[PDB]
RNA sequence: UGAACGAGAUUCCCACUGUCCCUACCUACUAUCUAGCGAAACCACAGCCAAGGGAACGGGCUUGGCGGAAUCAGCGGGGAA
RNA sequence: UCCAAGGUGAACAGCCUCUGGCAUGUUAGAACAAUGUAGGUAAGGGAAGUCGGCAAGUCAGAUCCGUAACUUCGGGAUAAG
RNA sequence: UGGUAGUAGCAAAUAUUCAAACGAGAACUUUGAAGGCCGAAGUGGAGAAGGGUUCCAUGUGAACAGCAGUUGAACAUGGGU
């Protein structure tokens, strides 16, 4: 069981995909959702909806 | 019932076209028997044929920009 | 108790789902009078004028998800159709539709 | 004129005419071996297709790249509630095939079970099986029913049970259970006669039929996809961009001798919708129903030895379009045949299960219960509502 | 005029008739079977049940083409349809029938369709136009309808 | 006037001709 | 020979793309069903095959296979359509 | 052939509106199967499809830069990037 | 005059809906309302060539206007440059 590289979600071991960049760097996604954003340069803290975002502006 | 000779005779009455003329949908039986422009006019004096005023088209959008 | 008076909120969203775009608008109006035979068990269904207007507000493409309407089983009187009673639909505006239930009307 | 580059056809011939099934229950068409020796048993069990899910186990078969590691392995949830027997029929083998003999039926039989036996049960009224009932009571039928059971002992070689769903249990809309009759392979027929007339009026749950880590047979119909082309019905090539007249379909339906399109050309016609019967499904979790233990209703149908959390087999908002599962379930590996709610008729193997798969014992260690209405990302509602907090809504 | 099967006995039957009846002759030779040996009473509730879709009329012979409904199943058929023009010329000379048997001082209430016939009226003649600069024919297929009602 | 048909269509009914005029190399190889 | 030019013929490369691997899904109008309306080509008779003989590739004759009302949507083997 | 509004924009381009005009082009209702005609998307690979990159797609406006081989010195040229 | 056959077809240019009126009869006419289109190289307003009463009023609904029609560039009667 892992967390999402973006969305900061919990993943379990039938969801989502694994993203391994070419410098060595092994990414956890939830879904396609969290995955399109992460490749589009999104900041996960400028995202309302993930854990980074609740962290940073104390939501939780 | 038909009123196509008075929606046309109220457009030349008017100066007007034929889709701004308005006849009384209460009163389509005093207009059926005003056959003459006289009777035209009469009719635009009786408030029963009213010319309908210019669709609203507001330069406000284009005078902000 | 056959003249009789309701306010309902017909689901517009859920009955013409899957229709194409220039047939929404007019199948939406055909739902509310499909909706005014099933529920008042009368034929001869007249929708107001300012119901047509409440369905046509956003074009014939996009139609009001809900809508409340006021359904009153009224009498002929003067027609001698197979009918004598007839239903005419009225529009009662309203901004929300949470807890809106089906009341009746006197 | 032989075709230069060789290529296999765009089908099997086995499972002709691709039409509609004349039924929609599936049917037993042949039931395991009767073997005297083993004790009595049913070898049938009627289930309804509730929906698929996967799993977490570790895999303990030695040499290979999989072995002592965890997996992900689709299963399909088949809820099935008890059965009641309803009936005995025998059957004598005749030159010209079984042949049914006598059949005798329960005393009292449901109203929902009676409502098979009828096209409109509303405006009909409840007329089935009146007079026969008075059978089991007057002492002229007492000793005629007793002359029909004796028949069968002596004259019947296989002794079938009907049994019925009990759609009550299920969240669907259909109240007309179904029929099915299910052949007893106990023993002689004289103990399958008096087992079986035991059993009248009396559930069979599925966990006496089917036991775990075992490999059964799954018949039923397909999902119906209404009149298809070649292209979706047999595979076949898409013909170019560039063809007149479509491009869909099989560009040559045979050659100009035999004058006669062949059979075994792939035409358009019905896909889905057919009777089919896939074997070696093997049962992953036999699940209990909502029951009261000690006063409060246990449902804990989804919990393995590992994972010791408090929740049911339905996931976040239940299986989607078929409901809850309240009852006793199958869980099978992998898909089965049909739709969702589509009655499936389970069946013990008509082989011998001695493979390294089959006799491979299986050990959950953990359900996905997460909403298949979209991308669930929350085992259980109180999971989720720790992990979120409160929201507006309280 | 003269009617095809002149009645059993005058004084107990009606008769109605129409010539040049501008509908479609096999729909409407259908439609006269599915009445014939029908008490008016049920034909007229049978024909009125056409014009709203809710009993089909058996194509019996003129079924080329013609789809397959439900209500084909109460005639031990398959392909049916819903002539209203037909439905709708029928009524009317069914009405009339039934007004020569109330001048006749016949009982309406008992009246049978014995015999009911549907020929073939001279074809009117209009054209279509078709490609490459041909006319084509665009003809139309009247009808002469006559029947006569007896009590039973 | 009991003729209203024909005499009004009289006018629109227009003579027409009874026969109307109307206006592969295949050559295998191998000889 | 040749700059510029070309809805001219041709080869390669880059880029691009369901051309393809290998298809899938969505939308509009059709097809489909109903009401009304309503043609045309075509047609010796007609219409299940195998083989044989035959004007040397039958649909009909010969010997066999056999053959069950009325039809719908498709289809493009055949009718040397 | 004659007269030619507002907005966007380089534009009598495209798109939206006003004056004016019309009722969707010789029919309607229901359904949303195959196959079509028209429109669109498709992961990974990128012409392996095919006689042939046919069809489709990529590129595109303007601004600031940068622009070869060759040449009839005009060009190529919106080269290309 | 048939079979074909009540079959092909009545599918180019986004789209209609509600109520009322007249009427034996309204998806199609008329009035009103709403929603749209043409978007000033118009589906706008006027001519030339050509047509020749198609113009206008009233009336008819029989044939024609490929569904219908209470409507028409149809038919009938008057008028009009
Ligand atoms: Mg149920
Ligand atoms: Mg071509
Ligand atoms: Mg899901
Ligand atoms: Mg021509
Ligand atoms: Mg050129
Ligand atoms: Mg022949
Ligand atoms: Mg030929
Ligand atoms: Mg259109
Ligand atoms: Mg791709
Ligand atoms: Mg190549
Ligand atoms: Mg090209
Ligand atoms: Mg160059
Ligand atoms: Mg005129
Ligand atoms: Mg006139
Ligand atoms: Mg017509
Ligand atoms: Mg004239």
Known sequence: VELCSFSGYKIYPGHGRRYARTDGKVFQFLNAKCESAFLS????????????????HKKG | SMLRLQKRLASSVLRCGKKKVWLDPNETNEIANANSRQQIRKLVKDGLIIRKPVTVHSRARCRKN | NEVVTREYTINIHKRIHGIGFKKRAPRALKEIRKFAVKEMRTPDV????????????????????????????????????????????????????????????? | SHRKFSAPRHGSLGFL?????????????????????????????????????????????????VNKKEVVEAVTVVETPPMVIVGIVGYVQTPRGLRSLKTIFAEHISDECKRRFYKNWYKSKKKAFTKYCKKWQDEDGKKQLEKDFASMKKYCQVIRVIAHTQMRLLPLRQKKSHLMEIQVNGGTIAEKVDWAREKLEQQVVIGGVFGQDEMIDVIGVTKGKGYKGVTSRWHTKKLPRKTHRGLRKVACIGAWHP??????????????????????????????????????????????????????????????????????????????????????????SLLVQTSRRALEKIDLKFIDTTSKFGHGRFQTVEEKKAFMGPLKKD | VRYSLDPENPTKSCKARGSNLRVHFKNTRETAQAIKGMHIRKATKYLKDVTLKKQCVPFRRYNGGVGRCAQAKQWDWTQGRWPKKSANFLLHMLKNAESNAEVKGLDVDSLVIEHIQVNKAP???????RAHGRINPYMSSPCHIEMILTEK | HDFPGEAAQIAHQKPRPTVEKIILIQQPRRC
């Open chain 1, 41 to 56: 340069k999104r900041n996960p803290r400028q995202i309302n909806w993930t854990v980074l975002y609740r962290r940073k």
């Open chain 3, 46 to 106: 007249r929708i107001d004028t300012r119901l047509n207007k409440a369905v046509w507000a956003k074009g014939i493409r996009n139609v009001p998800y809900r809508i409340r309407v006021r359904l009153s089983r009224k009498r002929n009187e003067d027609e001698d159709s197979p009918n004598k009673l007839y239903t005419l639909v009225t529009y009662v505006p309203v901004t929300n539709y949470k807890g809106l239930q089906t009341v009746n009307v006197d």
């Open chain 4, 17 to 65: 005419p691709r039409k509609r099934c004349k039924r929609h229950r599936g049917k037993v068409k042949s039931f395991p071996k009767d073997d005297p020796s083993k004790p009595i048993h049913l070898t049938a069990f009627l289930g309804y297709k509730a929906g698929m899910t996967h799993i977490v186990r570790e895999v303990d078969r030695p040499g290979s790249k």
């Open chain 4, 259 to 348: 004058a006669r399109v062949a059979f075994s050309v792939a035409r358009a016609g019905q896909k889905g919708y057919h009777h089919r019967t896939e074997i070696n499904k093997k049962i992953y979790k036999i699940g209990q129903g909502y029951h009261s233990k000690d006063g409060k209703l246990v449902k804990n149908n989804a919990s393995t030895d590992y994972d010791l959390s408090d929740k049911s087999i339905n996931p976040l908002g239940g299986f989607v379009h078929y409901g809850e599962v309240k009852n006793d379930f199958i869980m099978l590996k992998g898909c089965v045949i049909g739709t969702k709610k589509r009655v499936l008729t389970l069946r013990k």
């Open chain 5, 123 to 129: 074809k009117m003649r209009r054209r279509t136009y």
